[PDB]
Design a protein around this ligand. Structure first.
Ligand SMILES: Nc1ncnc2c1ncn2[C@@H]1O[C@H](COP(=O)(O)OP(=O)(O)O)[C@@H](O)[C@H]1O
Ligand SMILES: *CCc1cc(CC*)nc(N)n1
Lengths: 212, 27
C-alpha cells in the first residue's frame, strides 16, 4: 500500500499521504480543474525515493483526449531539481483513439510491468486520462448504455486486477477513491472516502506542476 | 517505441482470463 505524493502538501494530507497502490484514485472535474496537471505531476513524483514522496518507480500514461505533454514533464522535473531526460525515459505513454484500443493497451501494460519487475525502477503508476471519454462518444442512446456500462466496468475490473497484482497505483481522470476538483487556487474535495476523513484542500498549478 | 513480444502479450491475456506504448522521449 505504497503512497505517491501529489506535489502538494495540503492535497497529500487530504489523501492520507498521497495516492495509494492496489487502488484506483479517480479525479473528476471540468476542463482546467487540474486533473491532467495532477496526472503529469504524479508521473514525475513516483520516480522519487519514498523519503521524497515517490516509490523509485516508473509511470504509464494512457492518453484518450490528446492531453499528454512530454515538455510539461520536462518542466516539472527541471523545476523540482530532477534530470528531465531520465524522467522522460521512465514514463511510458500510449494514445487510445477508441474504447477498444484503450482496453487492448491494458494487456500490453500488464506485459511491461512483468518485465519492469526485477529491475530497480518497476512501474508503480498507471494513468488513464479521460477514462470515459471514448465510452461516452461511441455509446449514444439508451440502447448502447448496457454495452457502455459493461465495457467501462470491465475496464475498471482489469485496472483493479493490474493494481492488486503489480502493487501499482492507478490514477484515472473523468470529466474507488473519488476526488472532485474545481476552480489560481483550485479546490479538491473527497467523495465519501472509505477510510479517509471528509474534507477539502486548496492547491495551485505552477511551473513545478501541482503544489501548495 | 516499447515493444512487447507476441509471447508476453499471450501471457498477459492468460493472466486476466480467469498501436502500443513509447517512452515520453519517443522510443
Ligand atoms: N506549463 C504550465 N505552467 C503553468 N500552468 C499550466 C501549465 N500547463 C497548464 N497549466 C494550467 O493548467 C490548466 C489546465 O489544467 P488541466 O488539468 O490540464 O485540465 P484538464 O484536466 O481538464 O485536461 C490551464 O488552464 C493552466 O492554468
Ligand atoms: C501475438 C498474439 C496476440 C495476443 C493478443 C492478446 C492476448 N493480442 C494480439 N493482437 N495478438
Amino acid at each position: 500500500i505504497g503512497r505517491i505524493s501529489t506535489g502538494s502538501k495540503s492535497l497529500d494530507k487530504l489523501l492520507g499521504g498521497g495516492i495509494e497502490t492496489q487502488a484506483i484514485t479517480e479525479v473528476f472535474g471540468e476542463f482546467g480543474s487540474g486533473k491532467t496537471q495532477l496526472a503529469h505531476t504524479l508521473a514525475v513524483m513516483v520516480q522519487l525515493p519514498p523519503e521524497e514522496g515517490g516509490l523509485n518507480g516508473s509511470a504509464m500514461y494512457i492518453d484518450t483526449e490528446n492531453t499528454f505533454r512530454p515538455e510539461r514533464l520536462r518542466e516539472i522535473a527541471q523545476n523540482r531539481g530532477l534530470d528531465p531526460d531520465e524522467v522522460l525515459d521512465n514514463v511510458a505513454y500510449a494514445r487510445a483513439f477508441n474504447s477498444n484500443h484503450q482496453m487492448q493497451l491494458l494487456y500490453q501494460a500488464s506485459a511491461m510491468m512483468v518485465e519492469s519487475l526485477n529491475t530497480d525502477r518497476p512501474y508503480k503508476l498507471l494513468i488513464v486520462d479521460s477514462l470515459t471519454s471514448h465510452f461516452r462518444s461511441e455509446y449514444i442512446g439508451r440502447g448502447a448504455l448496457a454495452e457502455r456500462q459493461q465495457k467501462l466496468a470491465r475496464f475498471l475490473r482489469m485496472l483493479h486486477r493490474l493494481a492488486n497484482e503489480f502493487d501499482i497505483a492507478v490514477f484515472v481522470t473523468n470529466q474507488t477513491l473519488r476526488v472532485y476538483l474545481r476552480k489560481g487556487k483550485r479546490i479538491a474535495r473527497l467523495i465519501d472516502a472509505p477510510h479517509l476523513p471528509e474534507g477539502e484542500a486548496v492547491f495551485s498549478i505552477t511551473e513545478k506542476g501541482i503544489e501548495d | 517505441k516499447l515493444n512487447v513480444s507476441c509471447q508476453a502479450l499471450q501471457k498477459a491475456c492468460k493472466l486476466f482470463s480467469d498501436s502500443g506504448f513509447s517512452t515520453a522521449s519517443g522510443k
